[model samples]
Target: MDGEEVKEKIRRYIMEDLIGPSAKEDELDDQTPLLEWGILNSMNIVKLMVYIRDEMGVSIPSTHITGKYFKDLNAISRTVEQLKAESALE
Candidate 1:
């Protein structure tokens, strides 16, 4: 999938899992912090990483995990896109 596809998928995932059933698309922003919103905790982030890795068919090394990446939906999408591009090259 391309970046746009990945972004949409990420948006859907966040809306479904974190925002709950009544989530509106307008509430989301690139800078919205997941932890602050109670969408995910540190442990949940591990699960999220695994899901991204498996879904995208990429191996996310331990070193790549960072607060900046998981800070919000847009950051997560960017990280996934970067990993996808790297995996495609490999």
Candidate 2:
């Protein structure tokens, strides 16, 4: 899938599950720092990992358990697209 679609899905999940009614549509763009915004943490990170795998159809490796991969929506989508493409070959 394209990064844009992945990003949309990720954004939806974050807004609905994490931020809830407090989330602003315009504020949580691709460039927003999810971790820095207190939107992501150990508990939710595991939850997000499950969501990304089950809902998004991409299994991320533990090696990617770094802030850089999930720095923002754009980064997450990029990583998701990469993993999706890689797994398609297998």
Q: Which candidate leads the pack in TM-score?
A: 2
> Model 2 off-target regions past 4 Å?
1-3
Each model's total of backbone clashes: 0, 0
In model 2, what is the error at residue 23, expressed in angstroms?
2.8
RMSD (CA, Å), each prediction: 2.8, 2.0
lDDT of 1 by residue, 13-90 (tens): 777766668777787765777766777666556767776766777755778777777778777777777777776755
* Top of the candidates by lDDT: 2
Query: What is candidate 2's lDDT per residue for 1-90, written digit by digit as tens?
Result: 555766677788788777877777778777898887878876777766888788667777889877888888877777877888888867
TM-score of each: 0.66, 0.80
Q: Per-model C-alpha lDDT, please?
A: 0.70, 0.78
- How displaced is residue 88 in candidate 1, in Å? 3.4
Give RMSD (Å) of candidate 1 vs. truth.
2.8
lDDT of 2 at 34: 89
